[PDB]
């Protein structure tokens, strides 16, 4: 009938059984060609599902600084009137020299005034802009809502902050001993853990 015809057609698309089968030639042609169709489609679906499940995460083309610099389709610059800008000014390596030459003259000014300014500049840009920033503030704001900013690559160089003091000042030794004592004690690690990780605004083989 029609009810059993639908049942049989459905029972052959899911590769399950069929309590009946066509007995005439003209129903057997239909059954066979439907079997061929479902075989093709189901094999395709299963294979492409296997592909999707083990799908590699989006590998952005900005992984490397050299790649991020060759990608002139995305503009990039360093904060102006800052130590990082000075470093790139005095940078001697090939990639840094090329990036500095690119950023020396570009319209609009790839340089920026304040960190918030650069953050918003990258935010509004439809991925056509890149920004250079210290590795602490970057993470802190990548942790802050909205979490629409994402760091790519690793740190390009290792450096550190510092408790400055006027040259020839009398508060030089005491502050050095103070910072050493505070670093030896877990107080400083406690501060960093509390005020970077305790906030938490947002957030091949695997089950």
């Amino acid at each position: 009938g029609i009810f059993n015809s639908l049942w049989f057609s459905l029972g052959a698309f899911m590769q399950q059984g069929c309590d009946i089968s066509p007995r005439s030639l003209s129903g057997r042609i239909v059954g066979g060609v439907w079997w061929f169709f479902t075989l093709i489609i189901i094999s395709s679906y299963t294979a492409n599902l296997a592909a999707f499940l083990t799908v590699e995460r989006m590998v952005s083309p900005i992984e490397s600084a050299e790649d991020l610099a060759k990608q002139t389709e995305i503009a990039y610059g360093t904060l102006e009137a800052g130590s990082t800008k000075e470093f790139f000014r005095r940078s001697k390596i090939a990639v840094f020299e090329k990036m500095w030459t690119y950023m020396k003259s570009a319209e609009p000014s790839v340089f920026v005034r304040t960190t918030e300014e650069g953050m918003i500049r990258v935010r509004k840009s439809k991925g056509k802009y890149a920004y250079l920033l210290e590795s602490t503030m970057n993470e802190y704001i990548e942790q802050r809502k909205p979490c629409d900013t994402m760091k790519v690559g690793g740190n390009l160089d290792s450096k550190g902050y510092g408790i400055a003091t006027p040259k020839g000042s009398a508060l030089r030794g005491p502050v050095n001993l103070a910072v050493l004592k505070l670093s030896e004690q877990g107080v400083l690690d406690k501060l960093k853990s509390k005020w970077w990780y305790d906030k938490g605004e947002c957030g091949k083989t695997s089950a």
Partner: protein, 124 residues
């Protein structure tokens, strides 16, 4: 007394939400501020929270040879000390004394994270 130069950056120096209500040193609450409090308790020296008017970091222009920012206030005697994010480096260290580090860092690349279509319920 002590004059302290802070750049007022997130999260090293933050203005308390009750900025108008709060006043004085207690008005400000940031990682730089808490570090200043801890070190002062370690040494016992009076200080007054202050922020650099220029709102800039160390940058000595070639033509003028003048320091601006927190370092500018430090070199000319405007600021007594600077407990704030200030990348210790060569040219700056040539004029101003740096104590030993208190936090490692590095320059890094930031990009607007492309939206990834989280598999909906009907992802199959």
């Amino acid at each position: 007394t002590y004059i302290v130069t802070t750049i007022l950056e997130d999260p090293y120096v933050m203005l308390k939400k009750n900025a108008n209500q709060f006043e004085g040193n207690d008005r400000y609450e940031g990682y730089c501020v808490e570090l200043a409090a801890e070190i002062a308790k370690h040494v016992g020296y009076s200080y007054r929270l202050e922020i650099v008017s220029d709102g800039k970091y160390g940058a000595r222009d070639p033509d003028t040879k003048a320091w601006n920012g927190m370092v500018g206030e430090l070199v000319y005697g405007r600021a007594d000390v600077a407990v704030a994010p200030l990348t210790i480096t060569l040219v700056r260290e040539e004029v101003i004394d740096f104590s030993k580090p208190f936090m490692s860092l590095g320059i890094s690349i930031m990009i607007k994270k492309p939206q990834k279509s989280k598999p909906g319920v009907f992802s199959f």
